[PDB]
Amino acid sequence: ARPRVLTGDRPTGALHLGHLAGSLQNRVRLQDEAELFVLLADVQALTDHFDRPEQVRENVLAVALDYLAAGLDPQKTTCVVQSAVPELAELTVYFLNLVTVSHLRQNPTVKAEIAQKGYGERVPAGFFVYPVSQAADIAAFGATLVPVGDDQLPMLEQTREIVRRFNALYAPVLAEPQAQLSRVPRLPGLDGQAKMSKSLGNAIALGDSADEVARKVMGMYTDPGHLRASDPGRVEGNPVFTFLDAFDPDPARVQALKDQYRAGGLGDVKVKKHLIDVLNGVLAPIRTRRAEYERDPDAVLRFVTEGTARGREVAAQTLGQVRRAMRLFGH
Amino acid sequence: ARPRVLTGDRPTGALHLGHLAGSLQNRVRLQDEAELFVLLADVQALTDHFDRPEQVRENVLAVALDYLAAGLDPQKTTCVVQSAVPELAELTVYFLNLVTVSHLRQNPTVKAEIAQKGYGERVPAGFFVYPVSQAADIAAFGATLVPVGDDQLPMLEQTREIVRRFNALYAPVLAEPQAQLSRVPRLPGLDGQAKMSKSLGNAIALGDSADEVARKVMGMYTDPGHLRASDPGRVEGNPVFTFLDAFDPDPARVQALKDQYRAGGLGDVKVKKHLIDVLNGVLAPIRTRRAEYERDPDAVLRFVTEGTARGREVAAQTLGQVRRAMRLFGH
Ligand SMILES: N[C@@H](Cc1c[nH]c2ccccc12)C(=O)O
Numbered sequence: 001a002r003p004r005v006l007t008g009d010r011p012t013g014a015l016h017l018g019h020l021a022g023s024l025q026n027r028v029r030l031q032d033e034a035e036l037f038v039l040l041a042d043v044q045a046l047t048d049h050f051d052r053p054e055q056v057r058e059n060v061l062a063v064a065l066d067y068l069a070a071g072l073d074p075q076k077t078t079c080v081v082q083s084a085v086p087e088l089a090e091l092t093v094y095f096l097n098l099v100t101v102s103h104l105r106q107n108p109t110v111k112a113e114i115a116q117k118g119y120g121e122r123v124p125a126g127f128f129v130y131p132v133s134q135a136a137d138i139a140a141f142g143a144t145l146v147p148v149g150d151d152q153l154p155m156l157e158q159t160r161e162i163v164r165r166f167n168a169l170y171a172p173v174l175a176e177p178q179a180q181l182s183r184v185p186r187l188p189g190l191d192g193q194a195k196m197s198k199s200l201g202n203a204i205a206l207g208d209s210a211d212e213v214a215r216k217v218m219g220m221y222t223d224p225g226h227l228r229a230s231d232p233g234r235v236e237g238n239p240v241f242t243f244l245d246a247f248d249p250d251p252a253r254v255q256a257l258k259d260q261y262r263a264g265g266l267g268d269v270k271v272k273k274h275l276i277d278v279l280n281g282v283l284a285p286i287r288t289r290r291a292e293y294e295r296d297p298d299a300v301l302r303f304v305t306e307g308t309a310r311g312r313e314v315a316a317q318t319l320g321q322v323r324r325a326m327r328l329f330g331h
Numbered sequence: 332a333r334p335r336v337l338t339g340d341r342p343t344g345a346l347h348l349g350h351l352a353g354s355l356q357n358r359v360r361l362q363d364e365a366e367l368f369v370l371l372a373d374v375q376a377l378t379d380h381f382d383r384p385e386q387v388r389e390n391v392l393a394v395a396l397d398y399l400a401a402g403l404d405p406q407k408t409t410c411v412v413q414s415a416v417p418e419l420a421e422l423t424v425y426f427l428n429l430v431t432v433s434h435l436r437q438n439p440t441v442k443a444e445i446a447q448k449g450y451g452e453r454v455p456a457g458f459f460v461y462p463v464s465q466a467a468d469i470a471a472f473g474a475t476l477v478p479v480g481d482d483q484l485p486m487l488e489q490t491r492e493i494v495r496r497f498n499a500l501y502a503p504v505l506a507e508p509q510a511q512l513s514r515v516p517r518l519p520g521l522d523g524q525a526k527m528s529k530s531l532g533n534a535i536a537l538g539d540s541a542d543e544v545a546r547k548v549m550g551m552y553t554d555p556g557h558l559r560a561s562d563p564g565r566v567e568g569n570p571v572f573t574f575l576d577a578f579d580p581d582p583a584r585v586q587a588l589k590d591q592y593r594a595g596g597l598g599d600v601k602v603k604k605h606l607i608d609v610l611n612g613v614l615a616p617i618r619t620r621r622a623e624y625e626r627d628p629d630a631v632l633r634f635v636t637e638g639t640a641r642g643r644e645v646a647a648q649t650l651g652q653v654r655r656a657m658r659l660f661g662h
Contacts, residue, residue: 042660043424050428051500053658060660083659089424090417093374093464097381097457104456125435125460126427132456133424169382327384328414329373329391 001035001076005180006143008039008082011059012049015066016203017279018187018196021246023147026182028071030147036076037141037311038067040304042083044133047126064304066206069290074303080311081304082137087315091322092129092136098165099132099158107131107154135159139166139174140315147180171325174318184246188239192221204279206286213283217276222268229267240271248278332366336511337474339370342390343380346397347534348610349518349527351617352577355401357478357514362407368472368642369398371635374413374420375465378458379448395635397537400621405634411642412635413468418646422653423460423467429496430463430489438462438485466490470497470505471646478511502656505649518577519570523552535610537617544614545607548574553599560598571602579609 007027009015015024027036040063045056064079072079082088104110110131114123126133131154138146138159148156156179163174188194189202196203204216222240226233235241235258244254257274260266293300324331338358340346346355361367371394376387395410403410413419436442441462445454462485469477469490479487487510494505519525520533527534535547551571557564566572566589579585588605591597624631654662 046425046657047428050425053501057658057660081660083654084661086417086421090420092424093420093457094377096460097377097455099456100450100452101454101456101459102452121431121433121436123432124428125430125432125463126424128432129427129456129460170384323414326377327388329388329412330415 001033003034003145004037004141004143005030005034005145005147006037006039006138006141006177007147008041008137009063010041010045010048011056011063012045013059013198014062014205014207015070016196016198016205017247018189018203019066020070020206020282021184021187022149023182024067024070024072026147027077030145030180031072031076034145035078036072037078037080037143037314038072038307039137039141039311040064040079040081041137042081043089044082044130044137047124047130047133050124050126061300061304065290065293065300068293068300068303069206069286071286071289074299074306077307078310079303079307080141081308084308085140085312085315087312087319088133088136088140091140091319092133094322094326095132095136095139095162095166096129098162098169103158104128104131107158109151109154131155131158132162135162138177139163140318141311142175142314142318143177144175145180146177147182149182150185153179166325170322170327173321173325187246188242190216190220190239192237192239206283207290210280213279214276217272217279220272222272226268229269230264232264233261233266233268235261240268240275244271244275244278247282248275332364334365334476335368335472335474335506336361336365336476336478337368337370337469337472337508338478339372339468340394341372341376341380342387342394343376344386344390344529345393345536345538346401347527347529347536348574349520349534350397351401351537351613352518353480353514354478355398355403358408359402361478362404365476366409367403367407368409368411368474368645369403369638370411370413370468370472370642371395372413372468375461375468378455378461378464381455381457392631392635396621396624396631399624399631399634400537400617402617402620405630405637408638409641410635410638411472412639415639416471416643416646418643418650419464419467419471421650422471422646423464425653425657426463426467426470426493426497427460429493429500434489435460435462438489440482440485462486462489463493466493469508470494471649472642473506473645473649474508475506476511477508478514480513480517484510484512497653497656501658502652504652504656519573521547521551521570523568523570537614538621539614541611541614541618544610548603548607548610551599551603551606553602557599560600561595563595564592564597564599566592571599571606574606575609578613579606580612 040060049056060081134155146156160176163176166174187196189196189200191202204213223233223238248254257266257271371391373387373391380387465486477487491507494507497505518527520527522533535544553571554564554569575585588602
């Protein structure tokens with residue numbers, strides 16, 4: 001390994017294909033090419049589900065299982081439960097002094113999320129402030145590399161900004177994380193939307209059966225105006241093609257259906273039927289891996305408790321350097 | 332010692348006659364009819380002193396010395412360093428979900444502080460949400476009684492609202508704090524301004540030599556319309572008489588001085604000379620104990636390290652109930 005990479009998810013439900021193409025398979029590969037930390041963002045989940053704590057609790061082990069089923073080896077990845085690392089909240093408080101309300105107010109991702117949630121000015125303080133909580137996560141674990149979807153760059157950049165101001169004001173003991181950009185943008189939902197999410201109900205979960213995956217693909221949005229096979233169709237806006245573009249290994253094969261489709265002799269069903277097995281092929285192992293851990297629940301809890309202990313040790317080391325850099329009384 | 336009282340100060344400079352009249356005297360009283368905790372809030376002090384960590388650090392011990400000098404008994408009061416109790420930062424983050432940005436912006440006392448600070452919109456985030464970290468301080472130490480001036484009432488009411496919301500959402504595990512209202516009007520500065528402050532340069536510190544006190548009193552604003560002794564002078568607005576009301580043991584004398592002053596023949600000199608005698612009597616025992624704790628520096632450190640340990644333990648207990656009430660993973 002080499003760089004410390006920090007990635008994570010708000011435990012609110014089971015992971016889906018979006019996480020897969022979006023990042024899971026990426027960390028699966030940088031897992032032996034670096035020191036991977038996966039944060040089950042328990043606390044950040046509550047800025048949104050503070051009134052559904054049961055929901056979050058249940059999903060920590062659920063997402064950890066998704067992690068294991070996806071190919072993350074317990075011997076190479078450190079899984080950490082955020083709430084069991086209070087050092088993160090402590091650094092979040094110190095970090096809140098390094099940024100202004102106005103600056104937090106212009107974060108494009110949080111702004112859209114607020115508008116989507118319908119909060120108005122009645123935004124929960126913890127949610128409005130979550131980007132700095134993420135900044136604390138990154139710096140506390142000493143992460144130098146952070147995979148970021150095109151959508152999470154503002155947060156990465158604000159972390160670098162907070163980290164830089166911290167090093168200048170106190171002592172340079174924090175590392176500025178760099179971003180790792182990806183190719184496949186936010187995998188769209190079955191809906192045809194831009195975001196795939198169990199909330200939106202347009203998702204294919206990693207634990208869905210072979211039947212459900214097929215069903216999901218069959219109901220997947222395709223292309224209006226294209227009423228019957230024969231007719232010519234267009235790829236743009238069609239989620240089946242952007243799906244194949246992230247789950248199908250043979251592009252020469254992909255670019256192929258793209259030709260016929262634009263012509264008239266490739267029924268939407270054919271594209272779908274094909275895609276459903278390209279998905280079944282990428283999921284086949286995942287299902288069997290899941291089964292293994294489902295039978296070995298003790299192991300899942302192991303992965304989580306051992307990873308958390310390990311991550312806390314790193315967080316505590318960093319906070320020690322932080323508290324002395326800040327000249328807090330006693331250090 | 333029945334109800335638990337929590338009071339505090341942000342360590343940013345030495346304490347002065349304003350703190351003595353408006354809080355410390357009552358505090359020396361409370362340590363005998365309650366379990367008194369006094370928080371050296373260096374975390375909160377950093378909300379606006381994040382660019383001067385050294386100043387805050389050096390004032391933790393300096394204010395503790397002032398507490399001792401003022402008569403706070405190391406055997407009756409628990410003095411804790413906010414910094415040393417990370418549980419407070421942990422609880423503030425969870426409390427952040429129970430309040431809206433909208434409601435935080437409406438706080439009249441923080442709104443005025445932001446106005447006097449001149450931040451504009453460039454308000455540091457830590458400062459904007461400091462009322463919540465304070466609600467965390469109260470709830471964590473399990474305080475049921477909090478001395479308050481009508482200026483800190485919205486801080487208190489907001490703690491009450493947060494405690495209530497936390498109890499309804501999770502479990503009724505936090506004690507609702509009750510106010511111990513005012514201490515009668517705040518002491519004005521030497522120049523008659525509404526506020527006494529080292530920054531405004533119109534304060535008498537508890538540590539000032541009997542000499543210095545004398546000098547500061549002589550330079551006091553009085554009555555712009557009073558020019559010589561023979562002339563009648565005004566009492567209202569005259570801080571010299573406001574000082575006399577707050578510390579002169581016998582009102583019969585204060586009234587007589589007031590009378591003769593409005594009449595004529597009583598110059599500012601005689602009046603101030605008497606004020607010096609009264610302040611030296613109130614301050615004398617404060618200087619002696621202060622001097623003592625200067626010989627026995629370990630005694631001051633002992634006062635803070637021990638109170639902190641007790642405080643830390645109390646906060647750990649509350650967080651335990653908090654983590655279980657919130658159904659956090661592993662609790
Ligand atoms: N002046 C500080 C004093 C303080 C800090 N933390 C506290 C907690 C409880 C009561 C008072 C305080 C304030 O506005 O709060």
